[PDB]
Structure 1
Amino acid sequence: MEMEKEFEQIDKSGSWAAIYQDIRHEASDFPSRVAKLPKNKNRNRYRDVSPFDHSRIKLHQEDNDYINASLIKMEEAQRSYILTQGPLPNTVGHFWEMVWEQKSRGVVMLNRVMEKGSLKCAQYWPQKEEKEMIFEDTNLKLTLISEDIKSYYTVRQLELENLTTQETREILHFHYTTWPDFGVPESPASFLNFLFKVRESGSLSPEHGPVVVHCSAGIGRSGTFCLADTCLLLMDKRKDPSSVDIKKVLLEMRKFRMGLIQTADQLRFSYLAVIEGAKFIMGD
């Protein structure tokens, strides 16, 4: 069924909440024993959003290797992603340790530090060039190199130093600053423009570690980014582009982290984004 035809029949019958509950019913359910140990209690932003044990990202430390982050591997597509929660006050050093240890090139942030009059994350990168940050706990220095503020997003160059060794690496911060407080955007055009800006940078390419992607909980907004990116990749890759089924790709991705796409509005938007993206993909 050409994805767009399925979109029209679902939209006309008014059945997005219905379809979404079905995906939630067939989703995998694996154990997250480590996320729940008493010691890890202040490392989780939300009581009901946890990394599955089989796919969790482990820190290289002997003390406590735990972070709320999952490795998502889409095999046929040849693309991996790290999905994580917005850092907390006491996990900002762990966040930057993960970026270093996994060799990531880019970080994608899809929330504002404050939304709905509350804090969704910590201010985990420097606001100014001359005022760097040290994370004592993980032996790291982070420096703002450059900022490029656009209408729908901001792009930043950061330098990360492991003070243990004196090695430095350049990290790219892609910040989508315009998701509305409520709901999803009206047109996917600015979100697709943003996705392609991340792609262009090399941040999603196989010669780097996996990209790190986060929103507040790391499952909603994040899930949409990854779902859209994987579905366009497979359309470009397969012999039959129309054999790409969004529902199947989602369920495959939910094998690695719980709860990816949190509302039927967000599922509906992910179809829109892929559909509009296929005009590019397909020679246009």
Structure 2
Amino acid sequence: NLYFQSMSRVLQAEELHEKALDPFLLQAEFFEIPMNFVDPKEYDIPGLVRKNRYKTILPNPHSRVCLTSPDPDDPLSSYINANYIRGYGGEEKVYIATQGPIVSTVADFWRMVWQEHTPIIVMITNIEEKCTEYWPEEQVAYDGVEITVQKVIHTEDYRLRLISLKSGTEERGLKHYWFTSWPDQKTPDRAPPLLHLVREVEEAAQQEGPHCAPIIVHCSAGIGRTGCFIATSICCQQLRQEGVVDILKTTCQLRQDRGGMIQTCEQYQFVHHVMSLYEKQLSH
């Protein structure tokens, strides 16, 4: 309750199924949740306009990712439009929510990946787009790190790139999940593919072992789709642990970390469809 008083609505199975199908109650609830957007005038940095795809969608200062190499003291050099996001139960820095890289921010995004030892990127952008193609066909170096795409795995609903990051003696792997099945219509029947992504990614995160480095999630602005992904992930853990979901409270927690997470009412509803689905699957 740091930037606003968070809200709660604990759903057991039956209310979750019913809630997901009550759009009047969903909007009533949704449009009461504080957006917690940042005043653009918060950042007074020459050159900053080139670093943001949208002038009004900015990282909240208190949780922004600051790029400490090569000049932690230069506002511009240290800036990226990204926030650390708490996961389930408030675990610090489970995800990073960020905008889709733009031409002038590609090198910055990789700086972030390296700084953070990020093992997994989730990119949620249709093939028809917006977002810049920030990874190489095969290989490229930025700022002393060699990005090598080692393999492209095509699945029904995403393409998985296995990437090598090299600098010095040292070397790390990265999984890059490009999700291409994001619906224009957020109807129940378009929920299974996002569910499958969430599950594939939480498994992969588990496989990283104790204290996983931050998972980078991005769509155009880093709030709408990005927020849907992350809330769904959190609520999957909550349902499995607690036998209930609290998407209201999860959304609130998300918006404390980064303003506008889950941007639309149709997105909010979609998280409910997905979680209704999962609960049904989990009962078998």
Q: TM-score, normalised by structure 2?
A: 0.85
**Counterpart AA for 1:255:** Q
Q: In structure 2, what is the equivalent of residue 112 of structure 1?
A: 126
Q: Kindly indicate whether structure 1 or structure 2 has the higher relative contact order, using CA contacts under 8 Å at least 6 residues apart.
A: 2
**Which secondary structure does the structure 2 equivalent of 1:90 belong to?**
helix
Q: CA deviation at 1:17?
A: 3.0
Q: In structure 2, what is the equivalent of residue 46 of structure 1?
A: 54
Q: In structure 2, what is the equivalent of residue 76 of structure 1?
A: 89
CA distance in 1, matches of 2:278, 2:204: 18
Identity %: 30
Q: CA deviation at 1:76?
A: 1.9
Contact 1:44 1:68 in 2 (8 A): yes
One of 164, 168, 172 as aligned partner of 1:169:
172
CA distance in 1, matches of 2:29, 2:175: 37
Change (3 A) 1:157 1:84: same
Structure 2: unaligned runs, 5 residues or longer? 1-10
Contact 1:33 1:53 in 2 (8 A): no
Q: In structure 2, what is the equivalent of residue 122 of structure 1?
A: 132
Contact 2:38 2:60 in 1 (8 A): yes
Change (3 A) 1:77 1:274: farther
Q: In structure 1, what is the equivalent of residue 225 of structure 2?
A: 221
**Which secondary structure does the structure 2 equivalent of 1:259 belong to?**
coil
Q: In structure 2, what is the equivalent of residue 245 of structure 1?
A: 246
| Count of residues in Structure 1 that have an aligned counterpart in Structure 2 | 266
Q: CA deviation at 1:77?
A: 5.3
Deviations 1:121-140 (A, max 9, x none): 1111122x3xx1122xx222
CA distance in 2, matches of 1:205, 1:48: 37
Deviations 1:149-188 (A, max 9, x none): 11211111011122xx2421111111111113x3435331
**Counterpart AA for 1:71:** Y
**Which secondary structure does the structure 2 equivalent of 1:141 belong to?**
strand
RMSD: 2.4
Q: In structure 2, what is the equivalent of residue 92 of structure 1?
A: 106
Structure 1: unaligned runs, 5 residues or longer? none
Q: What does residue range 116-265 of structure 1 map to in structure 2 within 5 Å?
A: 120-127=130-137, 129=138, 132-135=139-142, 138-162=143-167, 165-180=168-183, 182-184=184-186, 186-202=189-205, 206-238=210-242, 241-242=243-244, 244-265=245-266
**Counterpart AA for 1:159:** S
CA distance in 2, matches of 1:13, 1:155: 34
**Which secondary structure does the structure 1 equivalent of 2:256 belong to?**
coil
